[PDB]
Design a binder for these strands. Structure first.
Ligand SMILES: [Mn+2]
Ligand SMILES: [Zn+2]
Length: 207
RNA sequence: GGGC
RNA sequence: GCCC
């Protein structure tokens, strides 16, 4: 609305906690970013630094629910009911807190660039690895094998017709890095954001 | 050819 | 199916 004037989706307390958590990100380490959903209506966001194993991973409820269902069928297969408990404002807050002039690597930078441009972050530099589907997803199976427990959102059947493994923003980052590095390391990853920041947590009585 |  |  024209009479609605809200600066942040998050409280100062939570913005301060986000600021501190994001000190785990190295401003100069290789950093992957991927999203599921349209750049103007993202539903899953991931950033990944292989050098430390740190990742940022969170979700967002879509506005265009009709487009979402169509995108789910052909790409991400995310159940929309699973996106209810998400934190609003988190996409903007994370992006706003990214280091100035950060270099982010991605596969098909067009959508990532639009999202970042829409958040006023034209200072961020983007490296596009511009691989084929085949080359970019060489380690798809090995990544899912090792890290499936890190995302449970992709339960829908995704079609290409032929059925395919759903696209996860987090698994994508990890497998794209594996492709470029020419191998997948066995290593335990670390979530940068606290769980209660990403999802609504826990009532002992209804009403 | 990419992306969802 | 929609986007570049
Ligand atoms: Mn992508
Ligand atoms: Zn996922």
């Amino acid at each position: 609305g024209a009479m609605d004037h809200v600066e942040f989706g998050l409280t100062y307390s939570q913005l301060m906690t986000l600021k501190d958590a994001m000190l785990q990100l190295d401003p100069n380490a290789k950093t992957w970013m991927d999203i599921e959903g349209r750049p103007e209506d993202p539903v899953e966001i991931a950033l990944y630094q292989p050098s430390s194993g740190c990742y940022i991973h969170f979700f967002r409820e879509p506005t265009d629910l009709k487009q979402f269902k169509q995108d789910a069928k052909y790409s991400h297969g995310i159940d929309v009911t699973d996106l209810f408990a998400t934190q609003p404002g988190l996409t903007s807050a994370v992006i706003d807190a990214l280091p100035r002039n950060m270099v982010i690597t991605c596969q098909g930078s067009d959508d990532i660039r639009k999202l970042l441009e829409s958040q006023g972050r034209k200072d961020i530099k983007l490296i596009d690895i511009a691989l084929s589907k085949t080359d970019s997803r060489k380690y798809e199976n090995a990544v899912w094998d090792q890290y499936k427990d890190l995302c449970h959102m992709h339960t829908g059947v995704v079609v290409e017709k032929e059925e395919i493994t759903p696209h996860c923003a987090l698994m994508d980052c990890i497998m794209f890095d594996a492709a470029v590095s020419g191998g997948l390391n066995t290593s335990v990853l670390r979530a940068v954001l606290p769980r209660d920041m990403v999802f609504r947590t826990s009532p002992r009585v209804v009403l």
